[PDB]
Amino acid sequence: GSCVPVDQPCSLNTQPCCDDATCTQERNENGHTVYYCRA
């Protein structure tokens, strides 16, 4: 049903990603650690 779009930020406590993506650690514009979705 509901999922996070790939290439978009996600959360370890939120719904999974879309297109069979995975929530991985990455860097943002600010430079702090974040979680994003990768197909």
Answer yes or no: are the C-beta atoms of 39 and 21 closer than 8 Å. Answer: yes
- CA-based Rg of the chain, rounded to a whole angstrom? 10
Query: Count of domains in the chain?
Result: 1
Amino acid at 16: P
Q: Which of 13, 12, 9 is nearest to 26 (CA)?
A: 9
The range of the structural domain enclosing residue 5 comes to: 1-39
The C-alpha atoms of residue 36 and residue 38 are separated, in whole angstroms, by 7
- Tokens representing 26 are 């990455």
Experiment type: NMR
| The CA-based dihedral angle spanning residues 22, 34, 26, 4, taken in that order and rounded to the nearest 10 degrees | 30
Half-sphere exposure of 35 toward its Cβ, with a 13 Å CA cutoff? 12
Are the C-beta atoms of residues 20 and 6 closer than 8 Å to each other? no
